[PDB]
Design a protein around this motif. Structure first.
Motif, short mmCIF file in Angstrom:
data_model
loop_
_atom_site.label_atom_id
_atom_site.label_comp_id
_atom_site.label_asym_id
_atom_site.label_seq_id
_atom_site.Cartn_x
_atom_site.Cartn_y
_atom_site.Cartn_z
N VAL A 1 9.19 3.50 -4.44
CA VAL A 1 8.75 2.22 -3.93
C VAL A 1 8.37 2.27 -2.45
O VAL A 1 7.62 1.45 -1.96
CB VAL A 1 9.83 1.17 -4.26
CG1 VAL A 1 10.04 0.22 -3.15
CG2 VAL A 1 9.44 0.43 -5.52
N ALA A 2 8.84 3.31 -1.75
CA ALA A 2 8.57 3.48 -0.32
C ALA A 2 7.41 4.44 -0.08
O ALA A 2 7.15 4.80 1.07
CB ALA A 2 9.83 3.98 0.40
N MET A 3 6.74 4.86 -1.14
CA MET A 3 5.62 5.78 -1.02
C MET A 3 4.27 5.08 -1.14
O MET A 3 4.21 3.85 -1.29
CB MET A 3 5.73 6.89 -2.07
CG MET A 3 7.09 7.55 -2.07
SD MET A 3 7.12 9.15 -2.86
CE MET A 3 7.45 8.70 -4.50
N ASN A 4 3.18 5.83 -1.03
CA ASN A 4 1.85 5.25 -1.16
C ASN A 4 1.48 5.26 -2.64
O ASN A 4 2.04 6.03 -3.42
CB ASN A 4 0.84 6.03 -0.33
CG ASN A 4 1.04 5.80 1.15
OD1 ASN A 4 1.38 4.70 1.57
ND2 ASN A 4 0.85 6.84 1.95
N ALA A 5 0.57 4.37 -3.04
CA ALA A 5 0.17 4.30 -4.43
C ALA A 5 -0.34 5.66 -4.89
O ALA A 5 -0.11 6.05 -6.03
CB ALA A 5 -0.90 3.27 -4.61
N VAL A 6 -0.99 6.38 -4.00
CA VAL A 6 -1.53 7.69 -4.32
C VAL A 6 -0.45 8.66 -4.76
O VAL A 6 -0.70 9.52 -5.60
CB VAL A 6 -2.32 8.27 -3.11
CG1 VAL A 6 -1.41 8.50 -1.92
CG2 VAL A 6 -3.03 9.55 -3.48
N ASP A 7 0.77 8.48 -4.25
CA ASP A 7 1.90 9.37 -4.53
C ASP A 7 2.86 9.03 -5.66
O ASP A 7 3.62 9.90 -6.10
CB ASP A 7 2.73 9.58 -3.26
CG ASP A 7 2.00 10.39 -2.20
OD1 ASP A 7 1.36 11.39 -2.58
OD2 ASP A 7 2.09 10.05 -1.00
N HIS A 8 2.85 7.80 -6.13
CA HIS A 8 3.80 7.43 -7.17
C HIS A 8 3.40 6.13 -7.82
O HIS A 8 2.78 5.28 -7.18
CB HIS A 8 5.19 7.27 -6.52
CG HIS A 8 6.31 7.08 -7.50
ND1 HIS A 8 7.07 8.13 -7.97
CD2 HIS A 8 6.77 5.97 -8.12
CE1 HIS A 8 7.94 7.67 -8.85
NE2 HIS A 8 7.78 6.36 -8.96
N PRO A 9 3.72 5.95 -9.11
CA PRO A 9 3.39 4.72 -9.83
C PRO A 9 3.91 3.46 -9.14
O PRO A 9 3.28 2.41 -9.21
CB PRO A 9 4.07 4.93 -11.18
CG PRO A 9 3.90 6.41 -11.39
CD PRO A 9 4.24 6.98 -10.03
N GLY B 1 4.27 3.18 -5.90
CA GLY B 1 3.86 3.16 -4.50
C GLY B 1 2.89 2.05 -4.15
O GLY B 1 2.29 1.46 -5.05
N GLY B 2 2.75 1.75 -2.86
CA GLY B 2 1.84 0.72 -2.41
C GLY B 2 2.40 -0.69 -2.23
O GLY B 2 3.61 -0.91 -2.38
N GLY B 3 1.52 -1.64 -1.88
CA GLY B 3 1.92 -3.02 -1.68
C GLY B 3 2.35 -3.37 -0.26
O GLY B 3 2.76 -2.50 0.52
N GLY B 4 2.27 -4.65 0.08
CA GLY B 4 2.65 -5.12 1.40
C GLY B 4 4.15 -5.04 1.64
O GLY B 4 4.60 -4.88 2.78
N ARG B 5 4.91 -5.23 0.57
CA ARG B 5 6.36 -5.15 0.60
C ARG B 5 6.74 -4.20 -0.51
O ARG B 5 6.02 -4.09 -1.50
CB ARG B 5 7.02 -6.52 0.35
CG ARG B 5 6.84 -7.10 -1.05
CD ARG B 5 5.57 -7.96 -1.11
NE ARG B 5 5.21 -8.41 -2.46
CZ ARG B 5 6.00 -9.15 -3.23
NH1 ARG B 5 7.19 -9.53 -2.80
NH2 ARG B 5 5.60 -9.48 -4.45
N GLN B 6 7.86 -3.52 -0.35
CA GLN B 6 8.32 -2.57 -1.34
C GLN B 6 8.90 -3.25 -2.58
O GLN B 6 9.83 -4.03 -2.50
CB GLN B 6 9.36 -1.65 -0.71
CG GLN B 6 8.79 -0.71 0.35
CD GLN B 6 9.87 0.08 1.07
OE1 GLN B 6 11.02 0.08 0.65
NE2 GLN B 6 9.49 0.76 2.15
N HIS B 7 8.30 -2.94 -3.73
CA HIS B 7 8.71 -3.47 -5.03
C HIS B 7 7.85 -2.73 -6.03
O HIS B 7 6.75 -2.31 -5.69
CB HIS B 7 8.41 -4.98 -5.13
CG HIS B 7 6.95 -5.33 -5.13
ND1 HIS B 7 6.32 -5.90 -6.22
CD2 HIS B 7 6.00 -5.21 -4.17
CE1 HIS B 7 5.05 -6.12 -5.93
NE2 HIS B 7 4.83 -5.71 -4.69
N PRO B 8 8.36 -2.47 -7.25
CA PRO B 8 7.51 -1.76 -8.21
C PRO B 8 6.40 -2.72 -8.68
O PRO B 8 6.65 -3.91 -8.90
CB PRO B 8 8.48 -1.40 -9.32
CG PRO B 8 9.49 -2.48 -9.26
CD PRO B 8 9.71 -2.66 -7.79
#
Ligand SMILES: [Cl-]
Ligand SMILES: [Cl-]
Ligand SMILES: [Cl-]
Ligand SMILES: [K+]
Ligand SMILES: [Mg+2]
Ligand SMILES: [Mg+2]
Ligand SMILES: [Mg+2]
Ligand SMILES: [Mg+2]
Ligand SMILES: [Mg+2]
Ligand SMILES: [Mg+2]
Ligand SMILES: [Mg+2]
Ligand SMILES: [Mg+2]
Ligand SMILES: [Mg+2]
Ligand SMILES: [Mg+2]
Ligand SMILES: [Mg+2]
Ligand SMILES: [Mg+2]
Ligand SMILES: [Mg+2]
Ligand SMILES: [Mg+2]
Ligand SMILES: [Mg+2]
Ligand SMILES: [Mg+2]
Ligand SMILES: [Mg+2]
Ligand SMILES: [Mg+2]
Ligand SMILES: [Mg+2]
Ligand SMILES: [Mg+2]
Ligand SMILES: [Mg+2]
Ligand SMILES: [Mg+2]
Ligand SMILES: [Mg+2]
Ligand SMILES: [Mg+2]
Ligand SMILES: [Mg+2]
Ligand SMILES: [Mg+2]
Ligand SMILES: [Mg+2]
Ligand SMILES: [Mg+2]
Ligand SMILES: [Mg+2]
Ligand SMILES: [Mg+2]
Ligand SMILES: [Mg+2]
Ligand SMILES: [Mg+2]
Ligand SMILES: [Mg+2]
Ligand SMILES: [Mg+2]
Ligand code: NA
Ligand code: NA
Ligand code: NA
Ligand code: NA
Ligand code: NA
Ligand code: NA
Ligand code: NA
Ligand code: NA
Ligand code: NA
Ligand code: NA
Ligand code: NA
Ligand code: NA
Ligand code: NA
Ligand code: NA
Ligand code: NA
Ligand code: NA
Ligand code: NA
Ligand SMILES: [Sr+2]
Ligand SMILES: [Sr+2]
Ligand SMILES: [Sr+2]
Ligand SMILES: [Sr+2]
Ligand SMILES: [Sr+2]
Ligand SMILES: [Sr+2]
Ligand SMILES: [Sr+2]
Ligand SMILES: [Sr+2]
Ligand SMILES: [Sr+2]
Ligand SMILES: [Sr+2]
Ligand SMILES: [Sr+2]
Ligand SMILES: [Sr+2]
Ligand SMILES: [Sr+2]
Ligand SMILES: [Sr+2]
Ligand SMILES: [Sr+2]
Ligand SMILES: [Sr+2]
Ligand SMILES: [Sr+2]
Ligand SMILES: [Sr+2]
Ligand SMILES: [Sr+2]
Ligand SMILES: [Sr+2]
Ligand SMILES: [Sr+2]
Ligand SMILES: [Sr+2]
Ligand SMILES: [Sr+2]
Ligand SMILES: [Sr+2]
Ligand SMILES: [Sr+2]
Ligand SMILES: [Sr+2]
Ligand SMILES: [Sr+2]
Ligand SMILES: [Sr+2]
Ligand SMILES: [Sr+2]
Ligand SMILES: [Sr+2]
Ligand SMILES: [Sr+2]
Ligand SMILES: [Sr+2]
Ligand SMILES: [Sr+2]
Ligand SMILES: [Sr+2]
Ligand SMILES: [Sr+2]
Ligand SMILES: [Sr+2]
Ligand SMILES: [Sr+2]
Ligand SMILES: [Sr+2]
Ligand SMILES: [Sr+2]
Ligand SMILES: [Sr+2]
Ligand SMILES: [Sr+2]
Ligand SMILES: [Sr+2]
Ligand SMILES: [Sr+2]
Lengths: 56, 73, 237
Positions: free
Chosen positions: C192-200, C202-209
Motif C-alpha cells: 500500500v506504500a508503493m507505486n501502482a507500477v510496483d504492486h496491485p 500501490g498508488g493513490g493519494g492516501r494509502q489504501h488498497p
RNA sequence: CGUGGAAGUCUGUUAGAGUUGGUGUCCUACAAUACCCUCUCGUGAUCUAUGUGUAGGGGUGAAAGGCCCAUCGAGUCCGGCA
RNA sequence: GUCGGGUGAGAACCCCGACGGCCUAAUGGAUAAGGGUUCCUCAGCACUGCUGAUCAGCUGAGGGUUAGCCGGUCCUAAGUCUCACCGCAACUCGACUGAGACGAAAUGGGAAACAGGUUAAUAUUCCUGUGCCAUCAUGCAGUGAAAGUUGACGCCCUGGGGUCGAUCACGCCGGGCAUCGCCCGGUCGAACCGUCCAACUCCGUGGAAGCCGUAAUGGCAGGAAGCGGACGAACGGCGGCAUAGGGAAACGUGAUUCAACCUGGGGCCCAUGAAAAGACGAGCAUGAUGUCCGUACCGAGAACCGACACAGGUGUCCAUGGCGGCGAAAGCCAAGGCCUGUCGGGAGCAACCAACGUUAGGGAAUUCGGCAAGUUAGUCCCGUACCUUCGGAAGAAGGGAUGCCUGCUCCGGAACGGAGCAGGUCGCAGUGACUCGGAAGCUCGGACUGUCUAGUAACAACAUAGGUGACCGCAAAUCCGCAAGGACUCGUACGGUCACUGAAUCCUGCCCAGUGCAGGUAUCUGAACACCUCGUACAAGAGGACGAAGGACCUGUCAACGGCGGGGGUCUUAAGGUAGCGUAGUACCUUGCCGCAUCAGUAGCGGCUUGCAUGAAUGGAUUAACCAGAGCUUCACUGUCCCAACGUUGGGCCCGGUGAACUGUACAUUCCAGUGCGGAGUCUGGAGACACCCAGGGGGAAGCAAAGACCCUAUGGAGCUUUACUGCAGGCUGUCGCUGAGGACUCUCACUCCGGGAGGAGGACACCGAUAGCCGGGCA
RNA sequence: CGAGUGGCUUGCUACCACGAUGUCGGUUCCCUCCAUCCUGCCCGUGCAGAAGCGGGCAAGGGUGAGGUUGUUCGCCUAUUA
RNA sequence: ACGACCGUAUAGUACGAGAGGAACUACGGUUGGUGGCCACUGGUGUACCGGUUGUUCGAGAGAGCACGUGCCGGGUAGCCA
C-alpha cells in the motif's frame, strides 16, 4: 554525493584488458570474456550484421 | 532487569523480557547431581558448572511444560 | 508494471537465498538394515543456525559422527538408540509401529525412510494416537490428524528449545540478526506504500488498497497478493 | 552501601559516516553538485577496502518512481532507419 | 617570504647562507590499487608550466629494477569456468547432477633471514658477517606411523606476564647558554642457538563441616588451604651470536607506566561467529640442489579517476614524539617535510564587494519567522519542578567555588597518580588564551535508534518491535524457467509464505445490500469428445441426450473493499455513527463565541462546538522518553532594528607579464510627445546634442542565456488505471493420447513417488502432450 | 430620474508577445497626479465663545511607529498638525 | 532649504447667565528635513602602553605563535553622530 566528478574518484578497477585472441583491449579480466571478439565465450568470432547498414 | 532498555520499548515488552530473563537466570537444579548450578549456554542449551552436564531444554527455561509431559507417558 | 517482490523471490538471487554455506547439518534419521543394534553417545550439544534451536552431536558404534534433531533433555554422555528394538525412551528413534500410543514424538517421517519431515521446529511435537497394522494416526503440531504408515520413523519426545517464541524481539536489530540466518528478504515494505507500477495495492493519494484484499486462488503470480483465497477475514463472527 | 559494567544509551570535528540552516561563497566555478561556518550519527538495523552475485519490461529498492558508470515513469551501443 | 651570494646572454620565483615562516593522522614515514619509465645522469628551452626560468613530472640521448628464506607461485572462500549429461528449431543459450580447473600480491591460510656496508639510480635481491627452511644423496640412529594435536576463528568486560616508547633517578660522553645553573643530544648492538616460566590442566600429600580466592564471577568431603610434582608462554628475560657491526666519544644502571607480543577469568545470542593446503606427531652428519614471474619511480592541493600540474574523489599501517588536558581534543613545539594550496610591482590603499573586529543609549522595535549573530560553557560543591511507561524528566532550574606562593595531611607499592588542609598573596578578569550547553513552558506529528528523493524535499514519508488477518502437512503454500530444471530449503506450523496496522496504555460499536473471497447447491444454465436423429451412397450442416468447473440460487466473512444518511414521530441501499475526539495539518461560513496574553494578538493555548465534509487496525483516544520535524510564550543575549560609524584582511584602482568567453542584421549622441500589429535610439513633430577617454551603481535596449515549463492544437509519444475495445500468459475444469487385467467398483503391468537395497506407497489416476469451457490489467 | 468624467476595481474582447516581456506581497530609490488628510488663504453655518459641520482656492512641504495575517485589503493600540 | 508643532506673555482677558474660553503681536523651545564641522560628549582607533593564560626560545631579561590584536584594561591623531 554527486554521481559526477566525486564518483569518478573510485575508478581504479581494471576490467577490459588487451585480448590474447584479437589484440583489442576488450578482454574483461573479471568475466574472462572479450567484448570485441567473444574470446572466452565462443570458438567463433563475435560478429553481427548490425555492425553495418542493412544493405551493406 | 530490563533497565538497560532505558525509557524505551514500553511496559509489555520490557516486563516480559524481565520475567523471562529473571527465570532464565535463576538457580536451576541439575538432572545429574541435583545441585542448583545449571546456567544457560545458548539458545536452548544448558550446562551444570558442577558436574559439567551439558543438555538441551527450553530456549529460556531448562524445562518446558511440554517437556515435563514426555516423562509421565 | 514491474514484477512484484514475490516474483523477484523465485529467481533465487543472493538477497532471497538462505545462508546455506553457514548451515551445519541436514538433520536426517540414520539408516539401519534391520534388527536395531545401533547406539551412540551424545558427544556435544550445538546451536543450529538454520533453526535457532539446539542440535546434538552423536557418535555411533560404527564410528559414525553426525548431528541429530535433539529433543528436550538430551545431555552429553546420554546413550541414544535407533532401530526397531530401540528402547522406548526420550531421544530414541523407532518406527511409529513400535512407539506406544499417547506418546509425544518429533521429527516424524512422511514416507518411511525419508529421514523425518514433520515436527522439527522449536518446542513442537506430534502426537501418536491410533495404532493398527496399516495406519498410525498422528496429531501434528497444527492440530491436523495425519494418517501415516506405521513404518515411518520418528524420535520420541518434544523438540528442544521450546518457548523460544515467548519473548518479543523488542527491537528491529534483534529481528535483523535472526533474519540474516534465514532465506528471507527483510524488512517488509507494505504494498500500500508503493507505486501502482510496483504492486496491485500501490498508488493513490492516501494509502489504501484500491480493491478488496481477498484474491482468487486462480489469480496469476503478479496479482496474487493480500489475502490469498481467504475463506473469511477478520476476528468477529 | 559497595561490587559489576549492561545499552540499536548519552557527550564527543577520536577515526569514520552523514548533511540541518546560512536560502552565505561560487554560479563562462577550483568543481557538469565545489568552498566555509553551523548541524546529525559515532558498539551498531554501524562504517569501510577488496573479492563476488543479480541485467533492461529485467535487476536492485527500510518505497523517493529511488538507483543500475554525469544516461532511468524503462540503461547504453549499433541496427531496423533516409 | 627577506638580505646577501652562486650560475647565466638573461634571474622576484634555479642553487648556497642567514633571517623569517608554514605542515603534526599530516604538507612527515611505509604501501594497495591505478599510472608506466613519470626514476637517475647529461644536454636543452621550439612545446608544456596560470607570469619568468639557467628549473622541471617538459624536449632529446644515455643509464637504472639482481632474491631458496619479501610478494607471486600452493590452498581453499563467496563464487566462476570447462567437459559430460539433459533441454532448445538451434547456438556463442539454459537450470541440475557428476568430474576437473579457476577464484585472496595492501587485508584469509602459508616451510625458511637477520644486522651492516655499497650506488647517480636497486637492495631481507648486490657485498661482508651470522643464521634458517625444504627436497634429495650418502652415513648413522630408526623401525615406530597415526591416532591425535595444529592450521582454525563471534561480540562485550576484565586480570596477569611483558618489549618499544615516554618519563623519573644517577653516572659517563658531547653540545648549548652565560648574573643564575640550568638546558639539549648520545650513552647502541639483530636474526638465530641455548636456557627460564607465569596462566591453564592434571597428579601425589594433605583433611577443611566453614574456610580458600577474586577487579568481578566464584571453589570445596564428587576432597578446600597448605606441601611436593607432571605438562606448559612471549615478537619477553637470561647467556652465546659480538677482539660482528656501529659510534667523534661515552659505548650506563635502576625504576614507573607499559603499544606490540604471551596467557587467563567473566558475560551475551530467537545472531553461534570459514574452508582447504600444510605443519606437528616423527632423530642427527655431511653434501647437493632451491628454477620461473614481480622488484625503478609516484601513490597525490603536479605521477591515480575526474577532458587540466582540477580547492573534488581515492584503501591500509605508522593511534605511544614533547607541553597540555579526560582525551588519538585545542593551542604551542620536535623529528621529518616545505616556502609549488606557484605570477608579480604600487597607491594610508577612494567608491563598491568578500570574510571579519569593536560600537554609546535602547534591546527583536527588525522579519513570514530572532534568519544572521550573539548569550551560555570546563571542573567541584549545594540544589533541583511538572510529568512518567518508575527507566526517566536531569547537566531541569537555581546558587557558590576556581590563580599563584609557603608548609602540609589523606588514599595508594608507587607515579613525573588522585582527594583535601592552613598561611601568605596579585589582577578589572584565575575553565584568564584555548577548549567549553543558553535556559523554561504550552500545542501539533511520529513512539523510540534507524531509512529516503547520488544533483532544490531528511519530513509528519519508508522501516521497526508490537497487534491482526490470510494460505499451506511438505509429492504443501508462495515464487522463477520455453524446457531441462530452480528459490524458499542443511527449512517443516514455536514453520514461512501473502497482506494490513504500526511501541506502551484505554479501547476497537453497527452493517454481508453491492463488490471481493470462500463453502454449499434440489432445481435452472453451462463447451468439446464420444453417443443419439435428420441430412449427405460419404462429408459439410441442422437437432437431441448427458452435463465439469463456472454462473443463477443459498450460506459464511468487514483487524475484505468499503458504508454508518434523508424525512417523520419508517425512505434509500445493509446499517444509520457507539468510546472518543472536534473550528482539527480534517470546519466553507471564519479573524466562529467566551476566556488567557499583549498598549494593541487573522497568531498561540483553554473552553464551547449542531462536525460545509471527525471517528474507531481506511484504526479512535491518549501518552513518558526521543527529534537538524510544524506553531506559540517567557528569562537571558545581541548592530536584526532605531542608525549608522570606525577599523582588519583579500580584492577593487595604477604598473610589468600572461590572456579567454558571452554577444554582434544594419545604422546608432539621445530626450519628450505622437504614430504604428495596440509596449519605437531608427517613423512624425519638436526639444537637446563638440569629439574621445576613466571609474561607478545597473533605468532602458519589452538586455544576455533556453525553438515556453503554464494554455490550447496534433485522427503526436510514453508511464499508469479500470467492470474501455481486443487479445496474450497463467490458474481451474471436461475430454483425447500415454492406458493395462477383472455409473459405481476390484486389480497390477505401464507411469509416479519413497527406499542404499530388498522392498514399500500410489496406480491406469497423477505427470506430460492435445483440445474445450470459466476466471484472467499478471501482460501486450 | 436624468447627463457625464476617469481608467484605481471587476467583467468583456482576443489586437500584441507562446525560438519566454520572470509571479503576489514586501522592500529600497526616483518622478508625477489631485478627486486635499494636515498645513496657508478664504465662503456659509442650525456662526456668542471654545470646538465643530459644509464648501472654495491650492499639490510647497508633510502624511509617521506598532500587535494578528504572506497577505494587498482590513481589524486593533498608542502617539500626531 | 526650509516644513510643522508645543509653550509663555497677550489672558483667566474678548465672548458667555455659567460652564467654558479665544486672537493680533512679541518671545522661548521641539520635531522632520537640509548643509557643514569635531572645541565639547560619544564610538572607532588589529598606532600605542599595561595586565595576563598555554606553549616554544634552558631560567631571568626579551621575544614568536594562539587568524590575520590569544584574551582582558586604557586609548592619541583622524574619521565620525
Ligand atoms: Cl521471524
Ligand atoms: Cl611485492
Ligand atoms: Cl582473573
Ligand atoms: K509571451
Ligand atoms: Mg535436516
Ligand atoms: Mg539474507
Ligand atoms: Mg512495513
Ligand atoms: Mg510514494
Ligand atoms: Mg498494476
Ligand atoms: Mg494509513
Ligand atoms: Mg490505510
Ligand atoms: Mg562489494
Ligand atoms: Mg509520486
Ligand atoms: Mg641540470
Ligand atoms: Mg629509491
Ligand atoms: Mg598546482
Ligand atoms: Mg550597542
Ligand atoms: Mg515592522
Ligand atoms: Mg541560528
Ligand atoms: Mg600512604
Ligand atoms: Mg494548530
Ligand atoms: Mg521518526
Ligand atoms: Mg535531493
Ligand atoms: Mg533529518
Ligand atoms: Mg509475530
Ligand atoms: Mg506479525
Ligand atoms: Mg508488522
Ligand atoms: Mg506511519
Ligand atoms: Mg478551540
Ligand atoms: Mg471496525
Ligand atoms: Mg514553444
Ligand atoms: Mg500540463
Ligand atoms: Mg498514448
Ligand atoms: Mg527423487
Ligand atoms: Mg495496459
Ligand atoms: Mg526584461
Ligand atoms: Mg480643485
Ligand atoms: Mg510636488
Ligand atoms: Na547494585
Ligand atoms: Na551543509
Ligand atoms: Na528497458
Ligand atoms: Na613561481
Ligand atoms: Na629467548
Ligand atoms: Na601526552
Ligand atoms: Na542514536
Ligand atoms: Na456486503
Ligand atoms: Na468513516
Ligand atoms: Na533520526
Ligand atoms: Na557589525
Ligand atoms: Na542598465
Ligand atoms: Na510517461
Ligand atoms: Na468615461
Ligand atoms: Na513585489
Ligand atoms: Na501640497
Ligand atoms: Na498591519
Ligand atoms: Sr564533499
Ligand atoms: Sr575503488
Ligand atoms: Sr562461455
Ligand atoms: Sr555472426
Ligand atoms: Sr530432508
Ligand atoms: Sr535422504
Ligand atoms: Sr493503492
Ligand atoms: Sr466484531
Ligand atoms: Sr549510541
Ligand atoms: Sr533551503
Ligand atoms: Sr569562492
Ligand atoms: Sr550551484
Ligand atoms: Sr555566516
Ligand atoms: Sr554522539
Ligand atoms: Sr537509425
Ligand atoms: Sr611514500
Ligand atoms: Sr627562451
Ligand atoms: Sr626528477
Ligand atoms: Sr590457484
Ligand atoms: Sr597474505
Ligand atoms: Sr599490566
Ligand atoms: Sr621501492
Ligand atoms: Sr587529496
Ligand atoms: Sr623541523
Ligand atoms: Sr610559475
Ligand atoms: Sr578597544
Ligand atoms: Sr519579534
Ligand atoms: Sr514584529
Ligand atoms: Sr552555575
Ligand atoms: Sr498513536
Ligand atoms: Sr544517499
Ligand atoms: Sr497501539
Ligand atoms: Sr457478501
Ligand atoms: Sr454521538
Ligand atoms: Sr561594473
Ligand atoms: Sr486643479
Ligand atoms: Sr486646510
Ligand atoms: Sr493588488
Ligand atoms: Sr479579509
Ligand atoms: Sr495660550
Ligand atoms: Sr475655569
Ligand atoms: Sr599575531
Ligand atoms: Sr572565554
Amino acid at each position: 554525493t554527486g554521481a559526477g566528478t566525486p564518483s569518478q574518484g573510485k575508478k581504479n578497477t581494471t576490467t577490459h584488458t588487451k585480448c590474447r585472441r584479437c589484440g583489442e583491449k576488450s578482454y574483461h579480466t573479471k568475466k574472462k570474456v572479450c567484448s570485441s571478439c567473444g574470446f572466452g565465450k565462443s570458438a567463433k568470432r563475435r560478429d553481427y550484421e548490425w555492425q553495418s547498414k542493412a544493405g551493406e | 532487569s530490563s533497565g538497560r532498555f532505558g525509557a524505551r520499548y514500553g511496559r509489555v515488552s520490557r516486563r516480559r523480557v524481565a520475567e523471562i530473563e529473571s527465570e532464565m537466570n535463576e538457580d536451576h537444579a541439575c538432572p545429574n547431581c541435583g545441585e542448583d548450578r545449571v546456567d544457560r549456554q545458548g539458545t536452548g542449551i544448558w550446562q551444570c558448572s558442577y558436574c559439567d552436564y551439558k543438555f538441551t531444554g527450553g530456549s529460556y527455561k531448562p524445562e518446558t511444560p511440554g517437556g515435563k509431559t514426555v516423562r509421565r507417558s | 508494471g514491474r514484477r512484484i517482490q514475490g516474483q523477484r523471490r523465485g529467481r533465487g538471487t543472493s538477497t532471497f537465498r538462505a545462508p546455506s554455506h553457514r548451515y551445519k547439518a541436514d538433520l536426517e534419521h540414520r539408516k539401519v538394515e534391520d534388527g536395531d543394534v545401533i547406539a551412540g553417545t551424545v558427544v556435544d550439544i550445538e546451536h543450529d543456525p538454520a533453526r535457532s534451536a539446539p542440535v546434538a552431536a552423536v557418535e555411533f558404534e560404527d564410528g559414525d559422527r553426525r548431528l541429530i534433531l535433539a529433543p528436550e533433555g538430551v545431555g552429553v554422555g546420554d546413550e541414544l538408540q535407533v532401530g526397531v528394538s530401540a528402547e522406548i525412551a526420550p531421544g530414541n528413534t523407532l518406527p511409529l509401529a513400535e512407539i506406544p500410543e499417547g506418546v509425544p514424538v518429533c521429527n516424524v517421517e512422511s514416507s518411511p525412510g525419508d529421514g523425518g519431515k514433520f515436527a522439527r521446529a522449536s518446542g513442537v511435537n506430534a502426537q501418536l494416537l491410533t495404532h493398527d497394522r496399516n495406519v498410525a494416526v498422528v496429531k501434528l503440531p497444527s492440530g491436523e490428524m495425519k494418517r501415516l504408515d506405521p513404518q515411518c520413523r520418528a524420535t520420541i519426545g518434544v523438540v528442544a528449545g521450546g518457548g523460544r517464541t515467548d519473548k518479543p524481539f523488542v527491537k528491529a536489530g534483534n529481528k535483523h540478526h535472526k533474519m540474516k540466518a534465514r532465506g528471507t528478504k527483510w524488512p517488509n515494505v507494505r504494498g500500500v506504500a508503493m507505486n501502482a507500477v510496483d504492486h496491485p495495492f500501490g498508488g493513490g493519494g492516501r494509502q489504501h488498497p484500491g480493491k478488496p484484499k481477498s484474491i482468487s486462488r486462480n489469480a496469476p503470480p503478479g496479482r496474487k497478493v493480500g489475502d490469498i483465497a481467504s475463506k473469511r477475514t477478520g476476528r468477529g463472527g
